[PDB]
Amino acid sequence: SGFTVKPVATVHRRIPDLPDCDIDKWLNNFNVPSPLNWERKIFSNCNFN
Amino acid sequence: PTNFTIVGQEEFIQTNSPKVTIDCSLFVCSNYAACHDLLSEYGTFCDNI
Ligand SMILES: *[C@@H]1O[C@H](CO)[C@@H](O)[C@H](O)[C@H]1NC(C)=O
Numbered sequence: 225s226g227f228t229v230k231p232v233a234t235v236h237r238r239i240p241d242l243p244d245c246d247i248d249k250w251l252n253n254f255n256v257p258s259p260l261n262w263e264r265k266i267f268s269n270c271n272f273n
Numbered sequence: 274p275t276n277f278t279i280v281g282q283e284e285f286i287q288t289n290s291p292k293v294t295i296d297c298s299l300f301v302c303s304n305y306a307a308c309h310d311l312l313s314e315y316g317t318f319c320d321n322i
Contacts, residue, residue, distance in 0.1 A: 225298070226296055226298070228304050
């Protein structure tokens, strides 16, 4: 019987997709608004972790 | 005839042929186990070949 060497590791690569919205960049902004001037931002069609 | 000569002719005759060996398992169900379990039903074609 012909033996076959088992694979040692696994390499996965996937084509990217819709760009990231960079929630951390907006959360780390230096212009902190007041509780009276609370800032609202909308986010859609993104991919966040 | 009054004058002659000697001519030569070549011919080839085949005697042997390349010996080909085929592995049934490595061709049909190389490494996977479910494939072998399903092929175990056809338990006569490989031995005949
Ligand atoms: C036969 O032919 C050869 C080659 O052409 C020549 O050398 C020879 O003299 C010839 N023989 C005769 C008897 O004519």
